[PDB]
Write a protein that binds this ligand. Structure first.
Ligand code: C7T
Ligand code: CL
Ligand code: ZN
Ligand code: ZN
Ligand code: ZN
Ligand code: ZN
Ligand code: ZN
Ligand code: ZN
Length: 220
């Protein structure tokens, strides 16, 4: 695997979005991964409808604004046989009756792949596949108010992941402690959070915040 990867500059990543007052991080993590793979496939970058996931992926076991799983969204897409674009079915940070329209579908998936649950397996996936859906332990105020730098939180749990985000790459930086490899992570809380909406999460410090523990991508 290369020492550095950043899919953003290869055109694989849409603008940072803001889930707002809806517990939909899983849906943003899911669209971002599907967006990267549709782009690998068609050469076209099209924003996908989180709302469409929020409103409709209930039979796959998502709970709308009360939460869900990325795997669950990928199955939805597969079972549904398509997914509407963002602009055909725009995001409203609530849940409403399913409004899916096959006419505006712009994306599909044939399933999904779970990646082996350690960081080296994740690095290869990110290197060869593209943006990868992951959950982290985001339940600490240091993360809620993250600004800049490699994020490292001492009581983060490798087992207590609570928040789906999107690994768009990875690399390295100079640091006083020479722990300076990071994962490049796209969040769904707005441009004003982190570094334009992104956080650098420590990498190869013992699966920090459990980033390698629940990582998957859809197959298109
Ligand atoms: N925004 C936001 C909120 N948070 C979530 O939506 C979280 C995101 C998540 C957390 C850990 C993950 C993944 Cl892939 C995703 O990795 C492994 C852990 C999975 C266990 O978590 C669940 C099991 C099942 C469910 C479904 C049953 N109710 C939805 C939901 C969850 C869930 O908690 N989803 C609602 C506040
Ligand atoms: Cl959230
Ligand atoms: Zn959207
Ligand atoms: Zn509405
Ligand atoms: Zn999975
Ligand atoms: Zn903490
Ligand atoms: Zn924690
Ligand atoms: Zn979340």
């Amino acid at each position: 695997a290369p020492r550095s990867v950043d899919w953003r500059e290869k055109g694989y990543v849409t603008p940072v979005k803001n889930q707002g007052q809806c517990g939909s991080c899983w849906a943003f993590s899911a669209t971002g991964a599907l967006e990267g793979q549709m782009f690998r496939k068609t050469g076209r970058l099209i924003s996908l409808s989180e709302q469409n996931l929020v409103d409709c992926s209930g039979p796959q076991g998502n709970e709308g604004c009360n939460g869900g799983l990325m795997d669950y969204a990928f199955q939805y897409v597969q079972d549904n046989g398509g997914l509407d674009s963002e602009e055909s079915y725009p995001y409203e940070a609530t849940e409403e009756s399913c409004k899916y329209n096959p006419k505006y579908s712009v994306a599909n998936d044939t399933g999904f792949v779970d990646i082996p649950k350690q960081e080296k397996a994740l690095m290869k996936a990110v290197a060869t596949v593209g943006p990868i859906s992951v959950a982290i332990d985001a339940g600490h105020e240091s993360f809620l108010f993250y600004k800049e730098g490699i994020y490292f939180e001492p009581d983060c749990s490798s087992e207590d992941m609570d928040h789906g985000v999107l690994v768009v790459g990875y690399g390295f930086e100079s640091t006083e402690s020479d722990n300076n490899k990071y994962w490049l992570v796209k969040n769904s809380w707005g441009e004003e959070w982190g570094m334009g909406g992104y956080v650098k999460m420590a990498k190869d410090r013992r699966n920090h915040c459990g980033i390698a523990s629940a990582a998957s991508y859809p197959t298109v």
